[PDB]
């Protein structure tokens, strides 16, 4: 059975976030899918540093 891992982090814009998601889905189809899944998350930038 698969074990979930959650790589994925800050990008620039929403289009870039969708492109990142499609890229990780492309990276799943090759080689393993029955041991590891590695779904990905995202979040966009903010001006204030401490908020980031």
């Amino acid at each position, epitope marked *: *059975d698969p074990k979930i891992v959650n790589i994925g982090a800050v990008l620039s814009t929403r289009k870039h976030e969708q492109m990142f998601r499609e890229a990780v*889905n492309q990276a*799943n*189809k090759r080689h393993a*899918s*029955w041991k590891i*899944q590695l779904n990905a998350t995202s979040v966009t930038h903010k001006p204030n540093a401490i908020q980031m």
Partner: antibody
Amino acid sequence: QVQLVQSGAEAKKPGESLKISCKASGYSFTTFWIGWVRQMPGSGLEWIGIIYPGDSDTRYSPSFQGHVTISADRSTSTAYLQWSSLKASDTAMYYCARSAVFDYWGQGTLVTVSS
Amino acid sequence: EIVMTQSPATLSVSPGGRATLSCRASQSVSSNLAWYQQKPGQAPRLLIYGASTRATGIPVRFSGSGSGTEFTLTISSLQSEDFAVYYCQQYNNWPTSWTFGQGTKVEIKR
């Protein structure tokens, strides 16, 4: 929790074309290499096809290349299988895989073509 | 394009012995393999993938070994519930090949 309930059994007269439905549940349908496997009465196994149900990228087996009509709906998670013709002497039983190591299997669906 | 040879054709053991089967490799098929159990009138299951790792929910008796040359599993202390047909199958260039075998068969002794 994964279930791969197939369609009920059916037999047909020679010549016609048939459809087989392998419904899925419990997981994101558009992430795993669904396939099919054959079994003749009192014999071994053979591989039919496989279809990554994200972009319908199929890769048929050379044994039945260009003879079957594998496909996969994205909405209801019901990757089908359709016949064209010449299905006369092919009485057997068919299963649907899950993930290219066959972690989960379905049930019994028998196809019998006779006069 | 590779033919899997499965031997022996039909074994037989007493309820409490052991077993030792064989999937002869016509080539050096990397280190990828599988081993399937199937009882009459039922859908097979998964036992070992990669020839060395156990799938979750499989009792501890089943184990195997192999390095791309006639890998082998040994069911130790075969109980009553076991003894149905077996199968071996490889996966090296996927998706291209998906070649199965013929598999042995185990029957109780009396």
